[PDB]
Amino acid sequence: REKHYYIGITEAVWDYASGSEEKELISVDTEQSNFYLRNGPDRIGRKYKKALYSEYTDGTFTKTIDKPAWLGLLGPVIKAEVGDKVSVHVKNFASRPYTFHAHGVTYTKANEGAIYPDNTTDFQRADDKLFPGQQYLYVLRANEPSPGEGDSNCVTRIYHSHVDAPKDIASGLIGPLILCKKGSLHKEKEENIDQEFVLMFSVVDENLSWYLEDNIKTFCSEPEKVDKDNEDFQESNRMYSINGYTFGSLPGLSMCAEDRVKWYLFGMGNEVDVHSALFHGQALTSKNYHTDIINLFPATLIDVSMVAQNPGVWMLSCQNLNHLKAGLQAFFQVRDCNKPSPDDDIQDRHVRHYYIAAEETIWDYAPSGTDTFTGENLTSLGSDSRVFFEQGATRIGGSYKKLVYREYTDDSFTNRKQRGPDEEHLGILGPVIWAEVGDIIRVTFHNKGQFPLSIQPMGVRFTKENEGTYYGPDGRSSKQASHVAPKETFTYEWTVPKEMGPTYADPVCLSKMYYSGVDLTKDIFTGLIGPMKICKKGSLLADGRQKDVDKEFYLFATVFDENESLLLDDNIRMFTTAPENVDKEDEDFQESNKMHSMNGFMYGNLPGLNMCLGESIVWYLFSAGNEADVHGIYFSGNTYLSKGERRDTANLFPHKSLTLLMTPDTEGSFDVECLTTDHYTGGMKQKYTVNQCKGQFEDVTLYQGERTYYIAAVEVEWDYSPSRDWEMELHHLQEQNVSNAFLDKEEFFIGSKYKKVVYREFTDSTFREQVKRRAEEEHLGILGPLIHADVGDKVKVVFKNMASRPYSIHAHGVKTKSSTVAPTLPGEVRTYIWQIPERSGAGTEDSPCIPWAYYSTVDRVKDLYSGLIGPLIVCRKSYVKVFNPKKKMEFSLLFLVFDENESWYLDDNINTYSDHPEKVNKDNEEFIESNKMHAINGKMFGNLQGLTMHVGDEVNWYVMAMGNEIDLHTVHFHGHSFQYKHRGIHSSDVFDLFPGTYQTLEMFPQTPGTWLLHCHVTDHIHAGMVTTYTVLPN
Ligand SMILES: [Ca+2]
Ligand SMILES: [Cu+2]
Ligand SMILES: [Cu+2]
Ligand SMILES: [Cu+2]
Ligand SMILES: [Cu+2]
Ligand SMILES: [Cu+2]
Ligand code: NA
């Protein structure tokens, strides 16, 4: 279809609380409320000026069309079906240059709506910058791999200005392009959908807007008492919002019961935006998999379905805790329009009645007081583990009073039900609640604590009465469910109807959690968290095991803020011997009580994780917390399959829950750990053990071929950005001046060139000749040599250490002989046996070539940041089969903010490169900035080159990301979409990366021009994690 959309960039004042409330929110008092919505002299408050898209009838732009209540500040909705030509008529009524850049959709270089160096001119910059008053036509065609085969009828896509996109997004220009299949739409609305909504979780940083100057003068009553760097002031401008509606203010979300609702969600913003949206007491599914949470990061695109049940009014919170108490809340209002309900009638309805008590104890994050890994007493002088565990003056140290759930046999909470053999790993986790689809869970809860508590589950049904978090006004009579008094008892009825359990395509049993629901921002962190496990009808033994599985495990990787324990007070009394000197707001104090743990154990001390070779293992993982609970739970040595995909590493977030299926092949003592730099060094690393419980020769199956890459570790001047002309043209085009923290040399600072240790390939085993880097290998940079392998091989890596301290080399997915890597001393040279079984390459639903990282493992963290990272691709042994022409290209992309401050080569870096080596205060955080290098494949600001291809090629992009907590990255390709999974059943143009995420992205280029490739997180675009790839016209 040929479609037209009239959209105008007007300027206006946007109210982030739109009256008149005066609601009852979770973990929010009016002090919180005020921090953000008072209001000068030194505070802008609750209304700001923003530039916003608006819909009109004509290209006269003389009458408008009202944007629905619930849209808030978002531009109007552009629906497009496949092959439609959409003509977006724009008029810039605002006071500055803006644009209209679309996403899941095809456009020439003069319908992009975006401005960078792309080699373009004159006729192709009419898109790139609409000056004030100018009108423009943006021509869109719905002609990518548009929605996937396995994607649903319509998917979430966005549009926004791209002059300085963070600053244009901040300023209010952002809106939804819903993208549907040919031809799902009857009268602009998906056939057989009753309700269509769009939501944005933006932490909308109004400090970054173009309208701060205009906003401080207009709203701050005394504008020279306004240090724009006032830590506090800045944070007073961070509107934790849903369509720009902070604190429960989002209006217009009402739906009749039994309505089919599509929700078109997306993240937007910066490092701070680690969302975790929850639609309270409601049925969710994404791609015919159940989802309880919906995480969203910057520009994370995703749709979901819901049949709206349970008339009433419910919270749509985000359970990132720091987000939650900055009021990232809103309500949706499920009607009782009296539609007839299709009631099965699940036969044979079973009742799982549990007896749990909340009570007190001391933990003992380290029973052993040592590091099973390094061997050391955790408190040794200089150790990274000391900080957390140190005791005396104003440091609590190693043990904390915690409330924790525990199981009792019955009614009278008198006999326990003692922690059995395999339940040894649970630790701080409460007892597992479990059920089948159709059941009726009940939980008799008794409190034996100082404070009042509850049990809020995740992903079961509960009537209003049973809801264990309080909020309103929602019409609740009893507050008893939500508030249980420090020695009271309540019970506690949940149902588990079909829609809350796992689907057709889902695993057997879903990973879930239950927590205490009074004040989430303290009760979970206090120890009030247990695992839950809802399973398919009859998939469970009457004892509660999965019918065909040997061992089940549970893991809760969270960072335990004791800092917000209900009992911080109680602990400062009970364990500091200068309690009067305890400054609760002292950074260095706060650190002491951040127990980076798994099941509340640290530095190797988790018992229970024990299994025999080749057993059916089913791991259930979950997490909770805030934007520093990004995780990569990597099992060394073994891998798992989850919904037909193969990895070894679990990316976890607040209220995320993963079910992993594993059958473990190599025998030994292997490492569960968080790849996230800080969690490792801070003690998030445990052990599991595969034992020989019969055997019994010593190989239990297979291998075939044998390949020999000659690799070497060396040791070189790495410039991160040798030209600057790209950066220079960028900033000249946007008319910005800007100097750069990282790159500019300053007085005392480094800039761009740093000594690093890179992997390289060598020809013989003499290493006198280093392989020359090809021409379509030249895009790799800091990466080591590409390593191909096929489902069957073995890989000899012969590794010389042409470096100056012990390194190693090893790869994810890959298999070896038993649970150990060998170090490789300088000058010395060594061989590694990487086996490549069935469990190292694609799974059912994986596309055939899948990448992994190979990296040093002397010092996981310091080695990795120093330069030692590479790609290993593990392709399925194809065929006798097909012949006649293909064409094909490959690109490995590694997204990493390289912490040069962690380099072994830092000393030498500083001495060598800085103008004055004396002025370098190493803890200076002007400096910890200059040396955080934001880069794709070790290169920045268009100095990652020879991403080059031709129209009609078949490109596989091997994207990976490693590193810290800051290293969440969102990959966006301008011009083109892509697919993932085998064949290409899911399409998107933003792929979400964290440390331990590796994925093959199938792209089919088709448009001549030079196109941009950024991380969509605001800090990283601006830091220089960006480049272009060129597509050429045959
Ligand atoms: Ca352009
Ligand atoms: Cu959030
Ligand atoms: Cu974008
Ligand atoms: Cu990024
Ligand atoms: Cu784009
Ligand atoms: Cu962009
Ligand atoms: Na404010």
Side-chain angles (χ1 to χ4, degrees):
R1 213 219 293 172
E2 271 229 318
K3 291 177 104 186
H4 303 260
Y5 274 90
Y6 311 89
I7 283 171
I9 303 165
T10 32
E11 248 169 25
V13 70
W14 169 249
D15 192 20
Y16 292 104
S18 296
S20 293
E21 297 296 75
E22 252 258 315
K23 300 211 166 263
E24 319 186 64
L25 310 185
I26 307 154
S27 308
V28 156
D29 45 43
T30 337
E31 194 184 30
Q32 299 322 293
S33 173
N34 292 294
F35 192 45
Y36 300 121
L37 324 175
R38 230 65 133 65
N39 210 344
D42 60 341
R43 295 285 183 277
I44 294 142
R46 122 189 146 82
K47 301 176 203 213
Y48 300 76
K49 192 179 217 166
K50 310 189 70 41
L52 311 176
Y53 298 112
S54 330
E55 211 169 335
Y56 297 85
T57 45
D58 298 332
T60 31
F61 296 78
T62 60
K63 101 139 188 176
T64 29
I65 304 136
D66 284 334
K67 320 203 303 197
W70 53 257
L71 255 161
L73 73 75
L74 291 197
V77 167
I78 315 184
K79 304 291 195 88
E81 300 166 315
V82 147
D84 290 11
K85 189 207 195 163
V86 174
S87 289
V88 157
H89 300 248
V90 164
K91 189 167 177 22
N92 175 211
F93 294 128
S95 84
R96 97 195 294 286
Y98 295 131
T99 60
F100 171 97
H101 169 87
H103 260 227
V105 138
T106 68
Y107 39 87
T108 80
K109 282 294 290 182
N111 306 125
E112 219 193 329
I115 190 166
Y116 42 106
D118 49 3
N119 192 36
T120 68
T121 195
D122 296 11
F123 157 121
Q124 304 205 285
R125 313 249 74 161
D127 70 317
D128 302 339
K129 197 189 280 177
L130 269 158
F131 281 115
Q134 285 170 4
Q135 202 161 341
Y136 192 63
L137 214 309
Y138 287 111
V139 197
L140 309 184
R141 257 189 210 76
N143 278 331
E144 293 303 350
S146 277
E149 221 317 275
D151 293 325
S152 49
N153 307 316
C154 289
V155 297
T156 72
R157 294 288 216 283
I158 77 190
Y159 58 86
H160 56 93
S161 175
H162 197 300
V163 192
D164 187 318
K167 292 184 83 65
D168 301 342
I169 271 169
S171 306
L173 290 168
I174 179 71
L177 175 41
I178 262 43
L179 188 64
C180 304
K181 294 172 178 166
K182 176 98 305 299
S184 315
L185 274 31
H186 174 43
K187 256 95 99 80
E188 305 280 308
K189 167 159 281 183
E190 189 172 335
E191 288 183 58
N192 309 140
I193 308 290
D194 301 300
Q195 287 303 144
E196 282 189 322
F197 300 122
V198 192
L199 313 179
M200 166 179 158
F201 296 46
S202 235
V203 160
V204 188
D205 184 13
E206 255 288 348
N207 284 281
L208 224 233
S209 186
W210 286 120
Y211 317 135
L212 200 62
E213 299 314 76
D214 192 314
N215 275 351
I216 293 170
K217 291 175 203 180
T218 302
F219 292 77
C220 275
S221 47
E222 280 173 63
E224 296 57 36
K225 305 198 168 191
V226 73
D227 181 15
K228 295 152 290 172
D229 303 37
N230 174 26
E231 196 83 4
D232 291 308
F233 174 47
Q234 304 225 76
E235 176 70 40
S236 106
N237 302 325
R238 305 215 183 96
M239 312 307 296
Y240 295 66
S241 52
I242 300 187
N243 289 347
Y245 280 119
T246 339
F247 298 89
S249 27
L250 162 52
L253 261 38
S254 144
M255 53 210 75
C256 297
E258 314 289 328
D259 280 3
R260 308 188 222 67
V261 186
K262 274 285 279 296
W263 299 86
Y264 301 87
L265 292 62
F266 62 105
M268 192 56 69
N270 210 305
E271 292 153 5
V272 309
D273 284 88
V274 165
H275 304 270
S276 292
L278 202 178
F279 289 64
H280 283 248
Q282 287 299 345
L284 262 20
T285 44
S286 177
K287 313 170 169 178
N288 328 328
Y289 300 122
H290 194 75
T291 35
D292 299 313
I293 216 72
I294 290 95
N295 316 322
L296 309 165
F297 314 68
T300 288
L301 308 177
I302 158 167
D303 52 283
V304 303
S305 292
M306 182 209 285
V307 191
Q309 298 281 226
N310 232 324
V313 165
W314 309 85
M315 181 69 66
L316 184 214
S317 50
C318 152
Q319 319 295 247
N320 180 310
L321 296 183
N322 296 24
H323 296 192
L324 184 53
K325 75 180 162 203
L328 201 174
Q329 310 207 212
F331 296 79
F332 67 101
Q333 319 185 112
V334 178
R335 264 51 286 203
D336 193 328
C337 300
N338 199 64
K339 295 191 156 197
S341 177
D343 271 300
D344 72 321
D345 212 63
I346 298 182
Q347 317 278 231
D348 201 7
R349 313 184 57 78
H350 294 141
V351 178
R352 318 294 166 164
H353 210 129
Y354 299 69
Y355 291 95
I356 319 186
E359 68 201 54
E360 324 198 320
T361 61
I362 316 162
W363 221 241
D364 258 348
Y365 290 110
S368 84
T370 24
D371 199 357
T372 313
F373 287 60
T374 50
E376 298 173 48
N377 199 327
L378 302 169
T379 55
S380 293
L381 281 73
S383 82
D384 292 308
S385 66
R386 187 176 154 74
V387 159
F388 295 70
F389 277 77
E390 180 182 35
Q391 200 165 43
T394 54
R395 219 106 297 171
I396 303 192
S399 290
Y400 300 59
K401 192 153 131 57
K402 299 204 74 46
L403 277 52
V404 184
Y405 290 87
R406 290 295 165 252
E407 198 158 18
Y408 286 75
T409 31
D410 94 308
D411 229 309
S412 53
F413 290 73
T414 38
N415 271 3
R416 307 196 130 292
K417 177 181 307 191
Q418 195 169 1
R419 197 115 292 183
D422 33 46
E423 310 98 292
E424 195 188 22
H425 72 280
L426 266 39
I428 201 79
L429 286 181
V432 174
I433 306 165
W434 61 255
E436 283 180 358
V437 155
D439 287 6
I440 309 163
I441 306 177
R442 297 218 201 75
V443 190
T444 301
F445 178 42
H446 170 78
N447 194 344
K448 293 157 52 185
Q450 348 289 201
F451 303 75
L453 309 164
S454 67
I455 308 187
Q456 176 84 143
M458 191 168 78
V460 308
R461 197 85 80 188
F462 38 64
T463 39
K464 211 80 201 74
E465 273 55 48
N466 296 260
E467 177 148 38
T469 334
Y470 190 59
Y471 60 62
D474 57 350
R476 284 195 244 176
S477 38
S478 190
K479 323 291 159 74
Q480 203 189 335
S482 57
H483 206 274
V484 170
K487 255 154 161 190
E488 270 192 315
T489 294
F490 179 75
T491 300
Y492 246 159
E493 180 179 288
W494 310 329
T495 66
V496 185
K498 37 175 288 186
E499 37 279 330
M500 223 87 187
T503 189
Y504 218 142
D506 264 303
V508 196
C509 293
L510 282 162
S511 186
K512 298 185 181 206
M513 63 220 261
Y514 65 81
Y515 36 81
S516 182
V518 164
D519 175 25
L520 287 72
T521 68
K522 299 180 164 300
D523 304 4
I524 282 159
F525 289 122
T526 297
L528 297 145
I529 178 65
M532 196 162 40
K533 199 196 111 190
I534 306 292
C535 301
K536 290 167 120 130
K537 171 70 104 161
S539 45
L540 280 183
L541 305 175
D543 78 86
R545 250 152 286 265
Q546 200 174 125
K547 281 182 174 204
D548 217 294
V549 184
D550 294 295
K551 315 203 82 60
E552 290 149 287
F553 301 112
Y554 287 94
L555 263 160
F556 181 48
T558 178
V559 192
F560 262 121
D561 256 329
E562 285 287 332
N563 285 337
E564 318 200 326
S565 197
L566 288 178
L567 322 166
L568 165 52
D569 289 330
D570 220 310
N571 280 325
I572 305 151
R573 246 178 305 292
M574 190 176 166
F575 300 104
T576 18
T577 53
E580 305 90 33
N581 297 124
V582 167
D583 185 357
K584 290 161 170 204
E585 313 314 313
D586 181 54
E587 282 163 352
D588 301 49
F589 172 70
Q590 272 166 319
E591 196 71 286
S592 161
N593 331 309
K594 277 172 167 177
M595 296 325 258
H596 287 125
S597 83
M598 278 169 272
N599 290 342
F601 291 79
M602 310 176 60
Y603 293 94
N605 299 54
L606 175 37
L609 292 183
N610 285 323
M611 68 214 80
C612 309
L613 212 96
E615 288 186 316
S616 276
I617 297 287
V618 173
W619 305 83
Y620 299 113
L621 303 225
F622 54 95
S623 182
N626 57 96
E627 69 282 312
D629 299 89
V630 317
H631 292 275
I633 301 315
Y634 153 61
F635 300 73
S636 74
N638 296 243
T639 71
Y640 62 93
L641 274 214
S642 288
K643 296 167 180 171
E645 304 194 295
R646 174 144 286 146
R647 258 165 324 253
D648 58 349
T649 307
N651 288 314
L652 275 172
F653 315 106
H655 294 224
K656 185 64 157 175
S657 67
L658 299 167
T659 310
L660 322 180
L661 293 130
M662 179 186 270
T663 299
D665 57 17
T666 170
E667 200 199 327
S669 180
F670 301 105
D671 317 343
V672 250
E673 75 216 37
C674 208
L675 287 183
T676 24
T677 286
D678 291 336
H679 296 22
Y680 187 67
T681 351
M684 194 169 312
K685 66 199 176 181
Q686 297 313 315
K687 300 283 200 191
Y688 68 115
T689 272
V690 198
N691 267 345
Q692 191 111 125
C693 308
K694 77 80 98 100
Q696 203 199 349
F697 270 129
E698 50 176 16
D699 271 310
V700 212
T701 35
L702 194 58
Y703 77 104
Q704 275 71 243
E706 259 154 85
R707 314 148 132 296
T708 65
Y709 291 91
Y710 309 108
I711 277 166
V714 4
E715 228 218 353
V716 60
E717 167 147 305
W718 191 261
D719 180 340
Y720 274 85
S721 176
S723 179
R724 299 195 83 165
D725 285 307
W726 198 72
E727 185 197 323
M728 293 314 84
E729 180 165 29
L730 209 204
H731 293 330
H732 167 72
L733 292 174
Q734 310 163 311
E735 304 186 45
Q736 299 187 349
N737 196 237
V738 207
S739 65
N740 193 234
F742 319 90
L743 270 49
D744 280 287
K745 217 199 190 313
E746 228 80 299
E747 294 176 69
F748 62 116
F749 280 138
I750 296 170
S752 72
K753 287 152 205 204
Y754 303 66
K755 186 103 141 56
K756 295 203 83 56
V757 46
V758 320
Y759 285 121
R760 294 293 189 257
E761 196 170 49
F762 278 85
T763 62
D764 24 47
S765 98
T766 86
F767 301 90
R768 293 197 294 283
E769 180 173 41
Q770 192 193 333
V771 168
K772 139 86 168 200
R773 206 63 144 186
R774 304 257 53 82
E776 60 218 60
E777 278 193 314
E778 178 253 35
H779 84 257
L780 293 196
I782 207 81
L783 277 152
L786 207 347
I787 298 175
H788 290 99
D790 286 76
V791 178
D793 301 10
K794 295 181 27 176
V795 206
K796 284 174 207 53
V797 202
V798 142
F799 182 40
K800 179 163 269 207
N801 192 128
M802 304 183 32
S804 46
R805 54 173 308 293
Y807 302 116
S808 67
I809 187 170
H810 186 109
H812 280 59
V814 157
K815 183 168 186 302
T816 82
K817 207 128 294 207
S818 82
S819 55
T820 286
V821 177
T824 299
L825 326 194
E828 184 213 296
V829 25
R830 185 186 291 264
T831 302
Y832 299 86
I833 280 175
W834 298 338
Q835 300 178 204
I836 324 290
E838 189 172 33
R839 70 70 153 158
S840 303
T844 333
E845 285 203 289
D846 284 284
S847 70
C849 299
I850 64 180
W852 311 91
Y854 74 79
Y855 61 160
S856 169
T857 88
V858 146
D859 195 315
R860 290 214 221 293
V861 187
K862 288 180 59 39
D863 297 343
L864 162 29
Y865 284 111
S866 299
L868 288 179
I869 196 67
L872 178 112
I873 337 295
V874 167
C875 296
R876 225 209 289 93
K877 155 181 78 216
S878 85
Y879 260 120
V880 289
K881 209 60 195 144
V882 260
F883 335 76
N884 312 64
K886 260 278 77 153
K887 187 65 214 206
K888 173 85 179 212
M889 298 256 200
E890 281 179 331
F891 293 116
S892 298
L893 288 174
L894 175 264
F895 288 100
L896 222 197
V897 187
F898 276 98
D899 220 308
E900 274 285 350
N901 308 294
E902 290 282 318
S903 195
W904 303 99
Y905 296 66
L906 184 43
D907 282 331
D908 312 56
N909 279 320
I910 298 157
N911 277 304
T912 319
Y913 301 99
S914 48
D915 299 60
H916 305 291
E918 338 92 24
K919 319 277 161 205
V920 170
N921 195 310
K922 294 217 322 207
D923 293 42
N924 184 358
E925 283 153 33
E926 301 305 316
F927 176 81
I928 287 174
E929 208 52 7
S930 161
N931 298 6
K932 271 193 170 51
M933 305 305 286
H934 290 73
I936 332 179
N937 297 344
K939 295 283 199 195
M940 298 200 198
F941 276 121
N943 293 357
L944 189 276
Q945 263 192 137
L947 290 181
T948 310
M949 70 223 66
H950 293 95
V951 169
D953 304 11
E954 262 175 42
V955 193
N956 276 203
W957 308 88
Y958 298 112
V959 290
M960 312 173 288
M962 285 299 272
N964 233 317
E965 298 172 355
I966 181 175
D967 283 289
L968 80 309
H969 300 279
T970 37
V971 196
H972 183 59
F973 295 104
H974 276 196
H976 303 95
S977 291
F978 50 74
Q979 314 89 82
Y980 52 103
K981 284 203 177 168
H982 73 342
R983 304 166 32 190
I985 60 173
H986 307 297
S987 174
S988 168
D989 72 336
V990 178
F991 195 67
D992 297 305
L993 298 174
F994 315 97
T997 330
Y998 322 105
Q999 210 87 170
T1000 320
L1001 297 179
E1002 279 156 35
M1003 178 156 129
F1004 289 69
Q1006 58 185 50
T1007 316
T1010 295
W1011 303 100
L1012 196 74
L1013 198 188
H1014 45 76
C1015 192
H1016 229 346
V1017 328
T1018 279
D1019 270 35
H1020 308 171
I1021 307 177
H1022 277 285
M1025 177 168 284
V1026 67
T1027 201
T1028 50
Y1029 70 94
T1030 325
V1031 157
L1032 287 160
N1034 292 103

